[PDB]
Amino acid sequence: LVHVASVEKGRSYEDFQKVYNAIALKLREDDEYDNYIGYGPVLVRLAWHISGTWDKHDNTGGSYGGTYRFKKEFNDPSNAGLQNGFKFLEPIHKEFPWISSGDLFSLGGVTAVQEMQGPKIPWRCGRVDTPEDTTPDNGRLPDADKDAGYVRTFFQRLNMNDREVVALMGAHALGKTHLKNSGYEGGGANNVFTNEFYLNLLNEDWKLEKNDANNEQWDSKSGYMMLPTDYSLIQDPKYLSIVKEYANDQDKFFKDFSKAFEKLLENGITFPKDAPSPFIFKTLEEQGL
Numbered sequence: 483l484v485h486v487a488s489v490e491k492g493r494s495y496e497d498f499q500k501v502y503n504a505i506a507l508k509l510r511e512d513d514e515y516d517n518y519i520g521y522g523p524v525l526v527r528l529a530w531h532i533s534g535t536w537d538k539h540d541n542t543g544g545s546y547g548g549t550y551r552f553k554k555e556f557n558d559p560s561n562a563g564l565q566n567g568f569k570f571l572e573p574i575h576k577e578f579p580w581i582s583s584g585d586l587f588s589l590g591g592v593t594a595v596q597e598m599q600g601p602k603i604p605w606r607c608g609r610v611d612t613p614e615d616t617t618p619d620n621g622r623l624p625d626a627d628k629d630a631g632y633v634r635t636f637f638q639r640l641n642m643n644d645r646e647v648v649a650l651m652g653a654h655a656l657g658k659t660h661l662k663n664s665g666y667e668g669g670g671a672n673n674v675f676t677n678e679f680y681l682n683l684l685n686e687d688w689k690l691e692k693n694d695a696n697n698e699q700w701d702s703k704s705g706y707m708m709l710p711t712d713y714s715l716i717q718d719p720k721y722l723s724i725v726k727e728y729a730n731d732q733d734k735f736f737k738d739f740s741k742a743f744e745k746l747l748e749n750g751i752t753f754p755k756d757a758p759s760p761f762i763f764k765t766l767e768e769q770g771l
């Protein structure tokens with residue numbers, strides 16, 4: 483199954499920076515969302531979940547087709563709460579009707595990471611919307627109540643190795659769990675991208691507790707929380723080594739996260755040899771906007 487990137491007609495870096503800017507401006511404007519966390523974290527999560535359906539074996543799912551817009555996928559129980567991110571992006575898509583859905587969703591994620599002071603994430607245009615019947619079935623996104631072996635195996639389907647998995651999970655520094663979405667509650671509620679997930683894993687005093695939805699989670703007196711799959715990264719000795727590396731090297735984490743997030747967002751896509759180079763968008767702050 484082959485998906486070839488096709489640039490929206492006539493569009494260049496400048497067009498997509500405009501889209502970036504609109505998303506970034508709306509992120510600053512609608513600052514009250516989720517108890518003043520803002521839409522940053524849910525847009526990152528949306529970009530991952532639209533990409534996380536990918537299957538390297540037959541190239542079903544993946545960000546290319548923009549299939550989150552179809553009910554089967556936006557109603558996936560794994561995607562509960564993502565509708566907020568989609569609703570955010572709706573006026574963006576109305577203003578820039580030329581961008582594809584997959585490009586918009588992935589770009590939402592990139593814009594969110596950068597505006598929250600994360601690393602630059604090179605981004606490539608050219609995803610093309612595909613019909614309803616290409617929508618992957620529910621069930622391809624990962625469970626939270628599992629261990630290190632589950633996590634490692636899960637991510638093999640997205641062609642990610644130990645380093646990539648540990649790097650990607652660092653996004654859980656952002657936002658929080660919502661009992662009504664996932665059966666988990668709590669969390670940092672941070673909207674600044676840093677390597678704190680690793681620091682928290684290593685430095686907090688964690689207690690295995692049951693939440694109000696009758697699910698187990700790791701809680702700290704400090705008020706942080708970790709999913710069983712998060713916590714598995716310090717139970718497994720290979721994952722633990724990498725957790726300690728990122729906890730001790732902000733720049734290294736930023737560099738690896740950037741590589742892994744782009745890869746994630748680009749899985750399944752074939753880029754023509756003469757496609758444009760990846761775009762690196764300036765932040766509003768860099769633009770003085």
Ligand code: HEM
Nearest residue numbers: 523524526527530624625626650653657658659660663664
């Ligand atoms: C084994 C892997 C993963 C599991 C089981 C998982 C699970 C979860 C769960 C259950 C939530 C809370 C949803 C809700 O209640 O609102 C959460 C939140 C989130 N996830 Fe993950 N996740 C995983 C990996 C990732 C990765 C790879 C990314 C992105 C690079 C990511 C980004 C986030 C972020 C940004 C949120 C915060 C959402 C917001 O605050 O609304 N997740 N995830």
